Structure 1
Amino acid sequence: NIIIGAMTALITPFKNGKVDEQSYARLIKRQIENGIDAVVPVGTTGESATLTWEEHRTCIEIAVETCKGTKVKVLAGAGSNATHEAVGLAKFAKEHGADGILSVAPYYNKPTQQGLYEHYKAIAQSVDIPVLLYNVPGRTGCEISTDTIIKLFRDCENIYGVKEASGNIDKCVDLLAHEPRMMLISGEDAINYPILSNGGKGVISVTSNLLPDMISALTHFALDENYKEAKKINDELYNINKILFCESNPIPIKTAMYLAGLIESLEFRLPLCSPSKENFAKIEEVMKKYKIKGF
């Protein structure tokens, strides 16, 4: 009982300080129409930290209602540095039609490996839908060790894999060599193919917000072991994959979506803000080299 394939960490477009819910549904439809397998509402790319609870819940509802009749699954962003908050988000996502949940490792409080095990066990025991771990130590300040990830996969029936955003291909080999039954998901666009070629079964992408057809083609070429095609797209996408992180995600990707005319206003919620005027031109310069799909 898995959620795999090409997935998009959806941005959360704002307009006049409010979630633009019409653009939000429209962007998800654009993902559905270009071969995306799942959408991740209210992730790191979705500015989950500055959204209220009612906005976090609304973006989940818009994702589930848009994907009805489609196979874009909804891996609802339900992570938190407080276990009771993460259990509450997991319980909401289940009761409102989400196919699974993405649960980021607790940030700022830096739990121990024992605490991470108990944190995700409480989340996994509160629902009966798949739970995908999310490891990003550069943002959280903590690391879910390989041993902890493997234990959670084997002890909790709904925990089926991990979204790795650590730039450590050695750990990816370590995970699948010792536990080949888990679903390793790439959370780093620049190394999507190396993660997929070693046995990864999907991506949760930032670049797919701008180029969903290319991320989708890459992931599915890799899943069919057509590595000559999968690597080609991964190499061609490297420049945009790196320039989308010249500043902290999701500042560059939202700037690109605005430059592509896909969102109406380049609005962030503080402490996030607009990029520099130099980076504004660099992102626009890199975008001119790629085929950006419309609506």
Structure 2
Amino acid sequence: DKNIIIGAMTALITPFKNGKVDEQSYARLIKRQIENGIDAVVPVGTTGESATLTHEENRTCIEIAVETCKGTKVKVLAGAGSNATHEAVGLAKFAKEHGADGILSVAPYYNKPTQQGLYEHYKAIAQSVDIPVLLYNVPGRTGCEISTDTIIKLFRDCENIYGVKEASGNIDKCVDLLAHEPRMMLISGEDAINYPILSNGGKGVISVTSNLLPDMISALTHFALDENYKEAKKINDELYNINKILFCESNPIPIKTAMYLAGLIESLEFRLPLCSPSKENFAKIEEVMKKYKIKGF
């Protein structure tokens, strides 16, 4: 029916060098994701520090992702959202112009639209492009919730809206969504509960942990999609300690720390207001990493 983008996906960190996007590191990281079974990559989402990138840096990250996935089956689901509808429409059109296969569009943050407003927000975005649109609910960061009813109405009313990324630690809501609209693509945005979401019929993940451990997240998701739930849970359980420690400080502070500790990025750099973890949490991230096998390039 609808065009979809599902499976194992990575919310890419954006590496910085001397305060600039390391464009070589970025392309190299994406290649490493492709080679470890990932099905799609998400440039400039939350994990990519979308908030602190200039518009040209946003274009650059998206274009590099498109260019690096050419010749592969891996799709580019571009972070393209904003708490201003006029801007979100513009960011959607631009992501499409630069070759993105679809867009991930975060619910408006800070200004707390009502459900009616969220509906009109996403309807305007979806009308402005002809590529798939994945809603993105993360109430702990936005201060609002796209309700089940709103999500289901948007899925049914707008042809290119095909599912939602849930980062709301609410398995009840995941049941609610797929019990009333089994045709939508529920996507886990919370690594520690990837398996519970997939086993209730979710069709993919947009992962933080896959930045560090893409082969494990790929295998988990693919097992689950193959209905080999036993093997998916085994990996989900193994990943629990790292899944949780990657949120000991606000994402992406721990994941960038882990990537640096693993030698996968050259510098532990953020853009303010993000900064390096405390010494104690730095030490905890390094401790948890010890029992995982981290792929190189």
Distance 2:257 2:87 in 1: 30
Q: Alpha-carbon deviation of 1:84?
A: 1.0
Distance 1:57 1:138 in 2: 27
SS at match of 1:45: helix
Percent same amino acid among aligned pairs?
A: 99
Distance 1:272 1:159 in 2: 32
Q: Alpha-carbon deviation of 1:90?
A: 0.4
Q: Alpha-carbon deviation of 1:105?
A: 0.2
Q: Alpha-carbon deviation of 1:85?
A: 1.0
Paired residues for 1:108-123 under 5 Å: 108-123=110-125
Distance 1:10 1:226 in 2: 27
Q: Alpha-carbon deviation of 1:212?
A: 0.2
1:157 counterpart (142, 156, 159):
159
Distance 2:107 2:134 in 1: 11
Question: Deviation string for 1:166-215 (max 9, x for gaps)?
Answer: 00000000000000000000000000000000000000000000000000
SS at match of 2:105: strand
Distance 1:73 1:257 in 2: 23
Alpha-carbon RMSD across the aligned residues, in angstroms, is 0.4
Q: Alpha-carbon deviation of 1:255?
A: 0.3
Structure 1: 4+ residue segments shifted above 4 A: none
Distance 1:255 1:26 in 2: 18
Q: Alpha-carbon deviation of 1:65?
A: 0.4
SS at match of 1:233: helix
Paired residues for 1:195-234 under 5 Å: 195-234=197-236
Question: Deviation string for 1:101-127 (max 9, x for gaps)?
Answer: 000000001100000000000000000
Moved more, 80-89 or 132-141: 80-89
- Give the paired residue count: 295
Q: Alpha-carbon deviation of 1:160?
A: 0.1
Distance 1:30 1:19 in 2: 18
Q: Alpha-carbon deviation of 1:96?
A: 1.2
Question: Deviation string for 1:208-229 (max 9, x for gaps)?
Answer: 0000000000000000110110
SS at match of 1:144: coil
Q: Alpha-carbon deviation of 1:134?
A: 0.2
1:17 counterpart (16, 19, 29):
19
Q: Alpha-carbon deviation of 1:14?
A: 0.3
- 2:50 equivalent to 1:48: yes
Q: Alpha-carbon deviation of 1:71?
A: 1.5
Distance 2:71 2:90 in 1: 27
Question: Deviation string for 1:56-103 (max 9, x for gaps)?
Answer: 111000000000011211000001111111111100111111100000
Question: Deviation string for 1:245-268 (max 9, x for gaps)?
Answer: 000000000000000000000000
Distance 2:107 2:21 in 1: 25
Moved more, 68-77 or 158-167: 68-77
Q: Does the aligned pair in 1 maintain the 2:59–2:98 contact within 8 Å? A: no
Q: Alpha-carbon deviation of 1:280?
A: 0.5
SS at match of 1:69: coil
Distance 1:252 1:173 in 2: 30
Distance 2:55 2:96 in 1: 16
Distance 2:74 2:214 in 1: 12
Distance 2:88 2:195 in 1: 31
SS at match of 1:49: helix
Question: Deviation string for 1:7-59 (max 9, x for gaps)?
Answer: 00000000011000000000000000000000000000000000011111110
Runs of 5+ consecutive residues of structure 2 not aligned to the other structure? none
Distance 1:57 1:150 in 2: 31
Distance 1:121 1:243 in 2: 37
Moved more, 91-100 or 183-192: 91-100
Q: TM-score, normalised by structure 1?
A: 1.00
SS at match of 1:157: coil
Distance 1:72 1:294 in 2: 20
